[PDB]
Amino acid sequence: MGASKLRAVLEKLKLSRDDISTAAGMVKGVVDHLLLRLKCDSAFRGVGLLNTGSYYEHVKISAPNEFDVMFKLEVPRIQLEEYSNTRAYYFVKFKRNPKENPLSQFLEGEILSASKMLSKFRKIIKEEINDIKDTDVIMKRKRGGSPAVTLLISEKISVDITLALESKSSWPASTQEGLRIQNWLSAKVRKQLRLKPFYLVPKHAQEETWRLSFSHIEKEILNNHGKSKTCCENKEEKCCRKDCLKLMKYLLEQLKERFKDKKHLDKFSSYHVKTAFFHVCTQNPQDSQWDRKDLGLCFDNCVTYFLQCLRTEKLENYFIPEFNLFSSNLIDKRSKEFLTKQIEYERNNEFPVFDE
Numbered sequence: 059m060g061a062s063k064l065r066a067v068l069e070k071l072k073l074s075r076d077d078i079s080t081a082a083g084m085v086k087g088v089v090d091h092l093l094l095r096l097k098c099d100s101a102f103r104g105v106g107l108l109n110t111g112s113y114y115e116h117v118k119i120s121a122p123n124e125f126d127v128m129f130k131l132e133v134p135r136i137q138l139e140e141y142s143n144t145r146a147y148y149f150v151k152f153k154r155n156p157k158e159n160p161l162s163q164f165l166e167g168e169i170l171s172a173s174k175m176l177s178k179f180r181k182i183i184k185e186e187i188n189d190i191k192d193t194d195v196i197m198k199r200k201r202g203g204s205p206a207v208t209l210l211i212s213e214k215i216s217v218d219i220t221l222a223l224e225s226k227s228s229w230p231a232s233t234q235e236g237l238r239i240q241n242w243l244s245a246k247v248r249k250q251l252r253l254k255p256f257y258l259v260p261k262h263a264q265e266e267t268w269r270l271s272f273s274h275i276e277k278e279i280l281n282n283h284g285k286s287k288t289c290c291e292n293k294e295e296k297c298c299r300k301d302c303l304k305l306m307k308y309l310l311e312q313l314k315e316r317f318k319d320k321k322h323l324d325k326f327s328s329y330h331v332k333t334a335f336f337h338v339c340t341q342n343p344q345d346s347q348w349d350r351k352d353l354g355l356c357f358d359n360c361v362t363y364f365l366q367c368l369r370t371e372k373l374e375n376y377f378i379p380e381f382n383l384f385s386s387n388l389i390d391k392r393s394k395e396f397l398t399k400q401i402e403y404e405r406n407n408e409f410p411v412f413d414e
C-alpha cells in the first residue's frame with residue numbers, strides 16, 4: 059500500500075505517453091519550419107533549436123497540449139555586466155564594435171536590447187504564420203516577457219517559444235560555487251560540463267537584462283544521472299531518481315489544479331521542483347540511495363527537502379548559489395506557508411491528490 063500507491067501513479071502517467079509523443083510531432087513540424095524562416099534573417103543567422111526541457115529529459119509526465127520550445131543563437135565575443143547584486147541577471151555588451159556582429163541593429167548604445175530583439179523575433183514568426191493560410195497555427199498576443207511568443211497549433215496545442223543567446227565563454231563568476239556534482243557525478247564530469255557554453259534568456263527583475271540558462275546541463279545530468287556509468291542500463295541498476303522527479307512534478311501539478319481558484323500556487327513552477335530535486339541528488343550521491351525498492355523512502359526525502367525550502371524561504375538555484383528562487387521578493391511568505399500546509403497534509407494522508 060505504501061510505495062505501491064506511487065507505483066500505480068507512475069503507471070497511470072505512462073498512458074499519456076502516446077498522446078504526448080503524437081503532439082510533440084505536431085510542434086516539431088511547426089518549429090522546424092519557423093527555424094528555416096528565422097535562418098533567412100541576417101540578424102538570426104546562427105539560429106538553431108536547443109533540444110532541452112522536460113520532453114527531452116524524459117520527464118514530460120502530463121499536459122500533452124502544452125509544450126516549451128527553446129531557440130539558441132550563437133553570440134560570439136560577448137561582454138557581460140551584472141545587473142545590481144542579482145547574481146543571475148546580466149546586461150549583454152559586445153567585445154568588438156557593431157560592424158563585426160550582425161545583432162548590431164538591436165544595440166541600444168553598446169548594450170544589446172532584449173526588447174528590440176524579441177520584437178523582431180515575434181514579427182518574423184507572426185508574418186510566417188500570417189503568410190501560411192493554415193488555420194491550425196495561430197499566435198496568441200501575450201502580455202510581454204519571455205517566452206514572448208506563444209503559439210496554438212491545431213486549436214489545441216499551446217507552445218511557448220523562448221529565445222536564448224549561446225555564449226561559448228567561461229561561465230560567469232556567479233556560477234563558481236554552483237553545480238555541486240563532484241561527489242555524485244564526479245569532479246571530472248563537473249570540469250567537462252563547465253567547458254560547454256552557457257545561455258542567456260531575456261528576463262527582467264531594467265527590462266534589458268538576461269537571466270543565465272543551463273537547460274542543456276539539466277538535460278545532460280538527468281539522462282546520465284547515476285554515479286555508476288551503467289545506472290538504469292540493466293535490471294540490477296534501475297534507480298528511482300527520474301520516478302521521484304516525475305512524482306514531485308505531479309504533486310505540484312495536481313495541487314496547482316486543486317487550487318486554481320484561490321491562486322497562491324501560480325508563483326510555483328516545475329522548475330522549483332526540478333531545482334530542489336537536483337539538491338536532493340547532491341545530498342544523496344550514491345545509487346544505493348535511489349534504489350527502486352526504496353521508492354517511498356526516496357520520494358519522502360524529496361518532499362521533506364521541498365518542505366524545508368518552503369519553511370526556510372530558501373531554495374538556491376542549482377548553478378547560481380546566491381540566487382534564491384524562494385526569496386521574499388520572488389514569492390511572498392503567505393504563498394509559501396499555504397503550499398507548506400498542503401504538502402504537509404498530502405504527506406500525512408497518503409497523497410490523496412494523486413488518487414483516481
Ligand SMILES: [Zn+2]
Nearest residue numbers: 284289290297
Ligand atoms: Zn539511474
